[PDB]
Ligand binder design. Structure first.
Ligand SMILES: CCCCCCCCCC(=O)OC[C@H](COP(=O)([O-])OCCN)OC(=O)CCCCCCCCC
Ligand SMILES: CCCN(CCC)S(=O)(=O)c1ccc(C(=O)O)cc1
Ligand SMILES: CCCN(CCC)S(=O)(=O)c1ccc(C(=O)O)cc1
Lengths: 606, 95
């Protein structure tokens, strides 16, 4: 008969001779092995995929005659180029099976018979998402690289039948170098092997694609492999690309060039092409504003980024402290006008003070609306650590609202003016990042306590409200606690040490009211004891202090904002480093010179 | 042999849950063999592709549809500190 269920059971056994007569049946019916009648249910999976899933000692003897049988059947849609068609496995092919099963012998046999090396396995199983998936890029070459198969990578790249283009891209526009950056994990076993796989593909690009800058190829997000390593927070492959140095044929593939070395001292030129904030959507802008990861503070402390951000900071520290001094003068005027308010020359100076506060409030409102307009595409990333950018917008809104309510003469202007005065001085703590000692301490102090106190507050407020409605209900009968607010406040005073715990003489149920207070005190102090010990257990872990690097990231975010100037006076950006000849491409690049002194590393080479 | 019940009505898998023996419990629960012994498996790999394995797990004593099942035992009949480590094993975690 040679129906599908015979053919699929035949090719699974690995015996080629049981195919005898399949040619005659296909020709007599006028059918093809890639028509729906020869496919597995709820997909497009063919007899060739069924054959390649069942390799014996690295090969299946049915593949060569099955491919002739298709070739002799006169098929317009060849069996090697047929793909799965359902929403999960769309574009999956026998060549992607052959590569995942690690058979170079089967990859050769398929490609020799004209299997298209550029087929994209693009269905949802092969996309990157939080469910069950396996992203490898989408192409045979990207699969061979991510499964660590040099011999298959070499064969796909330089076979005579159909060479894999190193310029080829998946549905996201990712090249094999973006795919390797997507698949990097920051563990020493993954990252070292991804670094080798990346370097050998880049070195092969210099043979196979000699005029093509493979690391200047952009995906559909506009990211090169280096920019993608920053956005995805992949420190190990990021550090490797950023600091890469080679000798001999591959020197132009370097980003770092040693200029001289003498004793413990190395002087190196680093290539700033994608890196300097003079370029829009550069690596520094990405780490600061487009990267989601915990790793951002570890990325700004790498060379050249560390010395490059110190060089920018030193050019801007006088602008940082000028901006602080204007804000001190604004907060002095705010305070001298919030104090000296009238009952609700000195009078015209008070009016001047209100106009200066209105103008400083509009200036800050426009400056923060410009920040959130520029940061629109990544707006949550641009405030998740940078909470002051919201608190300056809030202080400016409340400053404009309070002057508006004062022009309306409604007395609710004063509690808004006083709230924006408090926020105004709390916002003065932003500038503590300008010095190492205060700026590292502002990073030591604020932590995981903000996450867990918001969890404890639910337990504390169910206790506080549950006991407040009870003490109010029971203190109603005669032989404190007058309302839900007053009982919540008397019960809250026990946590500030002002409890007023007593056997109330006039209440009918005074012993039960005292037992309700003793129940609240004991339960609340057990809860506070559980809360402090829970916080110590997570936060006193011995992890080495990462505050210097989180402060270096705060200074990086500050620099990359200051380089634009102000919303009204948009600064022309200076370009870092020098245009220097590093070799023959000549190979002239904006290089930045770093000098490293390292006795501890150098003495180990003696 | 694993459907033989002691005087408490427990099979070896149900006894490993009641006594809280995570290592032998995990082993029985996830057991896979090839060749002559495949029917002695509780786990059958359906397909494997790259970092992804798809497996069928046998729920016979396990699903709470049965009275005195492994899930009821870990929750309500087991005395041990280990109960919280047993509910986070596969298939119990996804189930
Ligand atoms: C529009 C044309 C007129 C321009 C006038 C001059 C503007 C100076 C701007 C400036 O110094 O702003 C500092 C501060 C905002 O700080 P930040 O943006 O770095 O950080 C913000 C947080 N990310 O903002 C302020 O302190 C408010 C500015 C108004 C008070 C000026 C007092 C001058 C005393 C000498
Ligand atoms: C600018 C003077 C640099 N010098 C060392 C500082 C005293 S140097 O000795 O001239 C030198 C050393 C090493 C290399 C090299 O490694 O290529 C080249 C030059
Ligand atoms: C439902 C499609 C499953 N596929 C992988 C997902 C792309 S598959 O490649 O067809 C395959 C892989 C491996 C095995 C096996 O290991 O037995 C069988 C089938």
């Amino acid at each position: 008969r040679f129906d599908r269920d015979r053919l699929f059971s035949v090719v699974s056994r690995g015996v080629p001779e049981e195919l005898t007569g399949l040619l005659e049946y296909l020709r007599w019916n006028s059918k093809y092995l890639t028509d729906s009648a020869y496919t597995e249910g709820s997909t497009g999976k063919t007899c060739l995929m069924k054959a390649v899933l069942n390799l014996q000692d690295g090969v299946n003897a049915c593949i060569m005659p099955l491919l002739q049988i298709d070739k002799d059947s006169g098929n317009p849609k060849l069996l090697v180029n047929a793909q799965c068609t359902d929403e999960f496995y769309q574009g999956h092919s026998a060549l992607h099976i052959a590569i995942e099963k690690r058979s170079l012998q089967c990859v050769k046999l398929l490609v020799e018979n004209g299997a298209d090396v550029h087929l994209r396995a693009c269905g949802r199983f092969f996309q990157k998402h939080q469910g069950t998936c396996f992203y490898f890029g989408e192409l045979p070459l990207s699969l061979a690289a991510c499964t660590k198969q040099w011999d298959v990578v070499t064969y796909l790249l330089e076979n005579p039948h159909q060479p894999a283009s190193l310029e080829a891209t998946d549905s996201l526009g990712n090249t094999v170098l973006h795919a390797l950056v997507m698949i990097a994990d920051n563990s020493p076993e993954n990252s070292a092997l991804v670094i080798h796989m990346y370097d050998g593909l880049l070195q092969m690009g210099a043979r196979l694609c000699p005029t093509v800058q493979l690391e200047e190829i952009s995906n559909h997000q506009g990211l090169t492999p280096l920019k993608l390593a920053a956005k995805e927070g992949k420190i190990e492959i990021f550090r490797h690309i950023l600091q890469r140095e080679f000798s001999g044929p591959y020197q132009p593939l370097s980003r770092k060039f040693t200029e001289w070395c003498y004793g413990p001292v190395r002087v190196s030129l680093y290539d700033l092409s994608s890196v300097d904030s003079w370029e829009k959507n550069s690596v520094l802008e990405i780490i600061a504003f487009h990267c989601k990861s915990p790793n951002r503070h570890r990325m700004v402390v790498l060379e050249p980024l560390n010395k490059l951000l110190q060089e920018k900071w030193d050019r801007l520290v006088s602008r940082f402290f000028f901006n602080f001094a204007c804000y001190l003068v604004y907060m002095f005027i705010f305070t001298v006008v919030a104090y000296h308010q009238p009952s609700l020359f000195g009078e015209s100076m008070l009016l001047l003070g209100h106009i200066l506060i209105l103008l400083g409030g509009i200036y800050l409102l426009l400056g923060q609306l410009w920040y959130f307009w520029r940061r629109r595409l990544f707006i949550w990333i641009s405030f998740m650590d940078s909470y002051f950018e919201i608190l300056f917008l809030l202080q400016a809104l409340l400053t404009v609202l309070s002057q508006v309510l004062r022009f309306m003469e409604t007395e609710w202007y004063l509690p808004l003016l006083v709230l924006s005065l408090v926020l105004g001085w709390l916002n003065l703590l932003y500038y503590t990042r300008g010095f190492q000692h205060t700026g590292i301490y502002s990073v030591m102090i604020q932590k995981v306590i903000l996450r867990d106190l918001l969890r404890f507050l639910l337990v504390y407020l169910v206790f506080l409200f549950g006991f407040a409605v009870a003490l109010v209900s029971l203190s109603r009968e005669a032989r404190p606690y007058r309302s839900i607010l007053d009982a919540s406040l008397e019960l809250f005073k026990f946590t500030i040490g002002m409890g007023e715990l007593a056997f109330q003489e006039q209440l009918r149920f005074r012993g039960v009211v005292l037992l309700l207070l003793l129940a609240y005190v004991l339960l609340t102090y057990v809860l506070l004891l559980n809360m402090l010990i829970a916080l110590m257990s997570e936060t006193v872990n011995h992890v080495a202090d990462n505050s210097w690097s989180i402060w270096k990231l705060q200074k990086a975010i500050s620099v990359l904002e200051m380089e634009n100037g102000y919303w009204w006076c948009r600064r022309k950006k200076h370009r870092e480093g020098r245009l220097l000849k590093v070799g023959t491409r000549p190979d002239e690049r904006w290089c930045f010179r770093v000098e490293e002194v390292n006795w501890a590393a150098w003495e180990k080479t003696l």
